[PDB]
Amino acid sequence: MSPNGNLIRMLVLFFLESELHEHAAYLVDSLWESSQELLKDWECMTELLLEEPVEEAMSDRQESALIELMVCTIRQAAEAHPPVGRGTRVLTAKERKTQIDDRNKLTEHFIITLPMLLSKYSADAEKVANLLQIPQYFDLEIYSTGRMEKHLDALLKQIKFVVEKHVESDVLEACSKTYSILCSEEYTIQNRVDIARSQLIDEFVDRFNHSVEDLLQEEADDDDIYNVLSTLKRLTSFHNAHDLTKWDLFGNCYRLLKTGIEHGAMPEQIVVQALQCSHYSILWQLVKITDGSPSKEDLLVLRKTVKSFLAVCQQCLSNVNTPVKEQAFMLLCDLLMIFSHQLMTGGREGLQPLVFNPDTGLQSELLSFVMDHVFIDQEANKIEALHKRRNLLAAFSKLIIYDIVDMHAAADIFKHYMKYYNDYGDIIKETLSKT
């Protein structure tokens, strides 16, 4: 009770202090066989995190670690297998009973306590984003069963406070996924969550719309920018996993971008978010059209929208800020692939009017960016910058293979940048082998 509390405090210390386990997941997995009983005392952990001390209180670093270890033990119990990277997975009768009983325990416990944890740690972006990895392991039917509506209401209260307090993309994405999970995975509660969600969206689409109007009518304040960016960020996070087309967000995103091209003075993060948001609006418009039985006029409406947006991304390659260029580039390579002739697979030849062949101008600009921004002359941030330039090239590579760009002009550039490997590689290879 306090005994299991000491073991968990020291387990959190051994993790943080030693360098013998880099990953909480791997530490938990390693102790799992021997210490499952301790590692699922979730009442003990939530107690440590929620109680006030008598003496010796936990540090902010230690609290952070305990939450991370707790979410790891919650996954391990729910999934009943080692974490990604330690895999190899058939369960005995007793392991399956333990999985069900564990799923039942952590669900009852965290439905009650997860709202209290979010409340207390609401301002801590890393902590809240970890805590919000928890409902995905819930046995959501229990919200009905335990006459537990009061606690669903409480989680939604606290998610609302999180989204309202925060702009970090990790936190917003955690909130977006948590609404997803609560919705379309149990009809009983689907309606209650749907109401809380659209109310949240309504309040943010109003704030976004008023701020867009503020900024464009306006000289322009620091407030005027913060308000647009901050509200747009929330809606962009959500627009990936929630169809927000009923709010015409593409319209106001389009104006923001059209203004940043024209008078050249739109802040980079507004442009990036505005591009992402527009893209998500277009993907969702596409799903409603595929699955529906769309008219001729329906197709030509979306086509005008997609042509105007391809044009905005083309133009945003010329923006001075390289995060803008990368975003525009990534979207160009997505959209040019999506609205390729691929679209007329699976008997869906109705969609021909939605097909887009990029012009020479565009293909040349999609060549330029690769030369300028994938292949550049010159810690932790640089292994991350590299994987992105990889993802950029790979996105571009798909367009080459299907002749959507000039496959020759591309390979020519791939020669030019591989030269020293084709000219000296054998000599460099053998030299290095004998050392």
Residue 406 burial (C-beta neighbours within 10 Å; 0-12, 13-18, 19+):
middle
CA distance linking residue 66 with residue 48, whole number of Å: 9
Q: Do residues 61 and 16 make contact, with C-beta atoms less than 8 angstroms apart?
A: yes
CA distance linking residue 409 with residue 200, whole number of Å: 49
Q: Please enumerate in sequence order all residues whose Cβ is within 8 A of that of 229, keeping only pairs 6 or more positions apart, or say none.
A: 167, 267, 269, 270, 273
Kindly state the DSSP code that residue 263 receives in the 8-state scheme: S
**Residue whose structure tokens are 């810690």:** 379
Residue 250 burial (C-beta neighbours within 10 Å; 0-12, 13-18, 19+):
buried
Which tokens is 240 given? Answer: 């990936």
Q: Do residues 284 and 241 make contact, with C-beta atoms less than 8 angstroms apart?
A: no
CA distance linking residue 17 with residue 283, whole number of Å: 46
CA distance linking residue 408 with residue 98, whole number of Å: 59
Query: Resolution for this model in angstroms, one decimal place?
Result: 2.7
DSSP string over 192-227: HHHHHHHHHHHHHHHHHHHHHHHHHH----HHHHHH
Q: Do residues 275 and 329 make contact, with C-beta atoms less than 8 angstroms apart?
A: no
| Domain residue ranges in the chain | 243-357, 358-435
Helix axis angle, 169-183 to 222-239, nearest 10°: 40
Query: Which experimental technique did the depositors report for determining this structure?
Result: X-ray
CA distance linking residue 119 with residue 155, whole number of Å: 9
Which tokens is 155 given? Answer: 């989680």
CA distance linking residue 351 with residue 70, whole number of Å: 49
Which tokens is 322 given? Answer: 């390289």
Which tokens is 236 given? Answer: 């962009």
